[PDB]
Design an enzyme around this catalytic site. Structure first.
Site, PDB file in Angstrom:
ATOM      1  N   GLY A  24     -11.207  28.726 101.311  1.00  0.00           N
ATOM      2  CA  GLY A  24     -11.516  27.823 102.047  1.00  0.00           C
ATOM      3  C   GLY A  24     -10.529  26.902 102.091  1.00  0.00           C
ATOM      4  N   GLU A 137     -19.578  31.528  86.667  1.00  0.00           N
ATOM      5  CA  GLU A 137     -20.504  32.955  86.459  1.00  0.00           C
ATOM      6  C   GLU A 137     -20.372  33.554  88.028  1.00  0.00           C
ATOM      7  OE1 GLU A 137     -23.944  31.892  84.419  1.00  0.00           O
ATOM      8  OE2 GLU A 137     -24.387  34.191  84.058  1.00  0.00           O
ATOM      9  N   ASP A 180     -24.584  20.013 101.812  1.00  0.00           N
ATOM     10  CA  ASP A 180     -23.864  20.782 102.656  1.00  0.00           C
ATOM     11  C   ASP A 180     -24.271  22.119 102.317  1.00  0.00           C
ATOM     12  OD1 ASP A 180     -22.087  21.753 104.710  1.00  0.00           O
ATOM     13  OD2 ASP A 180     -20.346  21.545 103.612  1.00  0.00           O
ATOM     14  N   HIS A 182     -25.020  24.812 103.778  1.00  0.00           N
ATOM     15  CA  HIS A 182     -24.955  26.011 104.999  1.00  0.00           C
ATOM     16  C   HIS A 182     -24.959  27.165 104.198  1.00  0.00           C
ATOM     17  CE1 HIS A 182     -20.953  27.053 103.837  1.00  0.00           C
ATOM     18  NE2 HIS A 182     -20.462  25.804 103.901  1.00  0.00           N
TER      19      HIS A 182
HETATM   20  O1  LIG Z   1     -15.956  33.970  96.647  1.00  0.00           O
HETATM   21  S1  LIG Z   1     -16.857  32.949  96.926  1.00  0.00           S
HETATM   22  O2  LIG Z   1     -16.021  31.875  97.766  1.00  0.00           O
HETATM   23  N1  LIG Z   1     -18.146  33.418  97.854  1.00  0.00           N
HETATM   24  C1  LIG Z   1     -18.970  32.269  98.326  1.00  0.00           C
HETATM   25  C2  LIG Z   1     -18.532  32.035  99.868  1.00  0.00           C
HETATM   26  N2  LIG Z   1     -18.171  33.156 100.858  1.00  0.00           N
HETATM   27  C3  LIG Z   1     -17.310  32.849 102.084  1.00  0.00           C
HETATM   28  C4  LIG Z   1     -18.289  32.068 102.785  1.00  0.00           C
HETATM   29  C5  LIG Z   1     -17.825  31.243 103.862  1.00  0.00           C
HETATM   30  C6  LIG Z   1     -18.471  30.396 104.482  1.00  0.00           C
HETATM   31  C7  LIG Z   1     -18.186  29.104 105.049  1.00  0.00           C
HETATM   32  C8  LIG Z   1     -18.892  28.466 105.971  1.00  0.00           C
HETATM   33  C9  LIG Z   1     -19.789  29.082 106.645  1.00  0.00           C
HETATM   34 BR1  LIG Z   1     -20.815  27.787 107.786  1.00  0.00          BR
HETATM   35  C10 LIG Z   1     -20.250  30.372 106.384  1.00  0.00           C
HETATM   36  C11 LIG Z   1     -19.677  31.124 105.221  1.00  0.00           C
HETATM   37  C12 LIG Z   1     -17.438  31.805  95.541  1.00  0.00           C
HETATM   38  C13 LIG Z   1     -17.315  30.437  95.585  1.00  0.00           C
HETATM   39  C14 LIG Z   1     -17.661  29.658  94.465  1.00  0.00           C
HETATM   40  C15 LIG Z   1     -18.389  30.551  93.373  1.00  0.00           C
HETATM   41  C16 LIG Z   1     -18.663  31.846  93.490  1.00  0.00           C
HETATM   42  C17 LIG Z   1     -19.496  32.484  92.498  1.00  0.00           C
HETATM   43  N3  LIG Z   1     -19.714  33.799  92.665  1.00  0.00           N
HETATM   44  C18 LIG Z   1     -19.091  34.524  93.710  1.00  0.00           C
HETATM   45  C19 LIG Z   1     -18.374  34.145  94.826  1.00  0.00           C
HETATM   46  C20 LIG Z   1     -18.158  32.637  94.489  1.00  0.00           C
END
Ligand SMILES: O=S(=O)(NCCNC/C=C/c1ccc(Br)cc1)c1cccc2cnccc12
Ligand code: NI
EC number: 2.7.11.1
Length: 329
Positions: A24, A137, A180, A182
């Site tokens: 992000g 985690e 937030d 979403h």
């Molecule tokens: O790899 S991550 O970033 N996965 C979560 C977000 N996946 C992408 C989604 C982005 C997004 C952003 C805005 C909108 Br609307 C829809 C999707 C992620 C972030 C933080 C903690 C996590 C724990 N376990 C697994 C993944 C974790």
């Protein structure tokens, strides 16, 4: 204790196994494996002068609320009166100093090549650069990615029940608003447990999992308090947040600002109801279920969720909905 090196967080074998799993504007998320188990590592540049992914870096003062909030909500899994595992587990958090690890650039490049990235390659950091590294985690795959992958409307009902319960316990314990939530911030992972437990103001109840365990993540806009001390993100001057379009999501920011009269320090748990409405809307409009709504029982769950969508905005909090709404009885 002063910042630590990246090796403190990513010892050589943890660091060798990193693969990038998300991104992000904030930065980067890598998956690594310890004791045969994945973990998710969020790395956020702070205090530096470089534009990073088109925005300036947060100061420590600015990143602290996300840190505080992530710890509080994780600690709910160990509390008694108001207990839930429905927020992402925080294993640790460090302040790291150094340039970005070459092995993490490797993983970053592999991602860019296969999935594509919106982000600047993080290769321009100097050896004095500060980062916040949050080891979570592993929570699974976000609801947007699981769009086409939910079994049934019973699955969607379990997910909304889990989210409502989680928000209720956080409201009761911490006067929490996510602000937030979403569908990128609702993660789903398989569970072999038939029923999930939460305790709200001393009363324990169960939710059928339908084979999934939901974790809420991303507290960048969240608000809570402890002993009257409020921690939040003041967006009262932000222009951009409230001028989005193309999705109901962007209406929610505007509706929250209407509810709170642009006073983001205040507690308006109606914001949680707004987000749960948005999510209910996604369940009913943007999910392709793997199975058909072809049984009287499944048809009834569908009507119940449609009833939920049509009535939930007339409740005052996630706590109110969970305690009073017919969907959960
Ligand atoms: O790899 S991550 O970033 N996965 C979560 C977000 N996946 C992408 C989604 C982005 C997004 C952003 C805005 C909108 Br609307 C829809 C999707 C992620 C972030 C933080 C903690 C996590 C724990 N376990 C697994 C993944 C974790
Ligand atoms: Ni440490």
């Amino acid at each position: 204790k002063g910042p630590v090196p990246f090796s403190h967080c990513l010892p050589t074998e943890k660091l060798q196994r990193c693969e990038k799993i998300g991104e992000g504007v904030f930065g980067e998320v890598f998956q690594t494996i310890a004791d045969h188990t994945p973990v998710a590592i969020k790395i956020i540049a702070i205090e530096g002068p470089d534009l990073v992914n088109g925005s300036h870096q947060k100061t420590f003062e600015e990143i602290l609320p996300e840190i505080i909030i992530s710890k509080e909500l994780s600690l709910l899994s160990g509390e008694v009166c108001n207990r839930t595992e429905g927020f992402i587990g925080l294993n640790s958090v460090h302040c790291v100093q150094g340039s970005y690890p070459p092995l993490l650039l490797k993983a970053w490049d592999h991602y860019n090549s296969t999935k594509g990235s919106a982000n600047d390659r993080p290769d321009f950091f100097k050896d004095d650069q500060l980062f916040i590294v949050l080891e979570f985690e592993f929570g699974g795959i976000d609801l947007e990615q699981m769009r086409t992958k939910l079994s049934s409307l019973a699955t969607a009902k379990s997910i909304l029940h889990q989210l409502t319960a989680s928000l209720a316990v956080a409201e009761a314990s911490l006067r929490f608003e996510h602000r937030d939530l979403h569908w990128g911030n609702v993660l789903l992972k398989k569970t072999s447990l038939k029923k999930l437990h939460y305790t709200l103001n001393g009363k324990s109840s169960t939710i059928p999992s339908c084979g999934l365990q939901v974790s809420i993540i991303d507290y960048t806009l969240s608000r809570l308090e402890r002993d009257g001390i409020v921690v939040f993100c003041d967006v009262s001057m932000d222009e951009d947040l409230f001028t989005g379009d193309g999705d109901y999501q962007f209406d929610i920011y505007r509706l929250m600002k209407k509810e709170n009269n642009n006073r983001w320090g205040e507690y308006h748990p109606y914001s949680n109801v707004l987000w749960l409405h948005y999510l209910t809307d996604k369940m009913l409009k943007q999910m392709t279920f793997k199975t058909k709504c072809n049984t009287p029982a499944m048809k009834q769950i569908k009507r119940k969720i449609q009833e939920f969508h049509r009535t939930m905005l007339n409740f005052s909090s996630a706590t109110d909905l969970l305690c009073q709404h017919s969907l959960f009885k």
